């Protein structure tokens, strides 16, 4: 699949956190994404386990049941961020966290993701995902909510 | 880990059934307590090559909902029923449940696998699927069931 990377990936808590963007998409169920015709991009968080991930994920596996909030700010604009929540979904290249976003024209932007673990109060998927805690098959506790930032230049795609 | 027959290949996925000792899980109060169970039953679901829903080969298939039915051969005739829950363990993510069985002997195991958009799937409002030409994938598989036979001896 064809995508545009936003900066360089960041490694935190045995996970690789990468930011990418593409053209606005169409998704099932309908009515969750902002219509493709009213958006500029599909913003995406690519989260995969690294070697020796402490939550039992083999290397390169998708990290599931996370909750991602984003804030996008145009450099030299109003000063008010474009905010939203991502949603977990699958595309031709595999599962990810994404959202159709309307930007504020060509320019430099700051992108911030707030990544919530599966047990966070803010994560709506918390009652649906568990973690083994016994000695023989258990894993380490979940990481705590954290934020990651990148810069990028948007020209129009 | 103890196997429940042979894995079955359906709708671009490998579906395998296994069991091991009852486990402990966070959040507490979802699993039947390890001390009140005989086994932890699992559904191991991974994508095959050319999976029609965009999953690369060997990837875990997420946001599924699995219902199981376990009936002891020669017993009452009434199945032990339940819902599995998605979780992670040292060997990776899977769908599992702590289960109390009815003694050693032969059992029939049936899993009903619900796609992410099924009415019965409680995770349906939280998982999407791209449908556009450039990044889209094929529609979800329809709900299906898989069965195996196994002999239970214990621990
Ligand atoms: Cu997406
Ligand atoms: Cu389990
Ligand atoms: Mg991608
Ligand atoms: Mg214990
Ligand atoms: Mg296993």
Tallying the residues shown for chain B, one arrives at: 155
- Resolution value in angstroms: 2.2
> Do residue A26 and residue B130 have CB atoms under 8 angstroms apart?
yes
* 3-class DSSP assignment, residue A127: helix
Q: Which ligand is nearest the CA of A42, by number?
A: 1
Decide: helix, strand or coil at residue B125.
Answer: helix
Tokens 């059934």 belong to residue: B17
Q: Of the candidates A27, A94, A132, which has its C-beta nearest B54's C-beta?
A: A94
Q: Which residues of A touch B98 (CB under 8 A)?
A: none
> How far is it, in rounded angstroms, from Cα B111 to Cα B2?
17
User: In Å, how far are A28, A69, A125, B85 from B122, measured between CA atoms?
Assistant: 16, 22, 10, 11
**Residue B95's beta-bridge partner residues?**
B43, B86
CA distance B48 to B70: 27
* Secondary structure letter of residue A37 according to DSSP: G
- What tokens were used for B81? 């029923």
CA neighbor of B44 nearest in space, from B79, B80, B1, B82: B1
Contact check, Cβ <8 Å, B128/A55: no
CB of A98 within 8 A of CB of A34? no
Residue A17, burial from CB neighbour count under 10 angstroms (0-12, 13-18, 19+): buried
Q: Mention every residue, 6+ apart, whose C-beta is less than 8 A from residue A84.
A: A69, A70, A99, A101
**DSSP notation for A64-96:** -S-EEEEEEEETTS-SPPEEEE-EEEEETTEEE
Distance CA A88, CA B32 (A): 29
Structure tokens at B53: 């829903």
Task: Bin A52: left if φ > 0, else alpha if -120 < ψ < 50, else beta.
Answer: left
Structure determined via: X-ray
Q: Determine the distance separating the centroid of ligand 5 and the alpha carbon of B119, expressed in angstroms.
A: 27
Tokens in use for A112? Answer: 């911030």
SS3 B103: coil
| Burial class for A54, CB neighbours closer than 10 Å (0-12, 13-18, 19+) | middle
Domain boundaries, chain B: 1-155
Q: Provide the residue count of chain A.
A: 157
DSSP calls for B133-152: TTT--PPPPPPEEEEEEEEE
Judged by CB atoms closer than 8 Å, whether chains meet at B136 and A91 is answered as yes
């Amino acid at each position: 699949m064809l995508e545009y990377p936003i900066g360089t990936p960041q490694n935190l808590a045995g996970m690789e956190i990468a930011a990418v963007y593409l053209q606005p998409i169409d998704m099932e169920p309908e009515g969750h994404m902002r219509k493709a015709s009213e958006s500029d991009i599909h913003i995406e968080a690519d989260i995969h386990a690294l070697s020796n991930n402490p939550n039992g994920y083999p290397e390169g596996f998708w990290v599931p049941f996370l909750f991602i909030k984003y804030e996008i700010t145009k450099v030299g604009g109003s000063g008010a961020p474009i905010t939203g929540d991502m949603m977990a979904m699958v595309a031709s290249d595999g599962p990810h966290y994404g959202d159709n976003v309307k930007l504020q024209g060509p320019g430099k932007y700051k992108v911030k993701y707030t990544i919530y673990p599966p047990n966070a109060k803010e994560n709506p998927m918390s009652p649906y995902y568990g973690r083994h805690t016994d000695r023989e098959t258990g894993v380490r506790p979940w990481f705590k909510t954290f934020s990651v930032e990148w810069d990028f230049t948007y020209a129009g795609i």
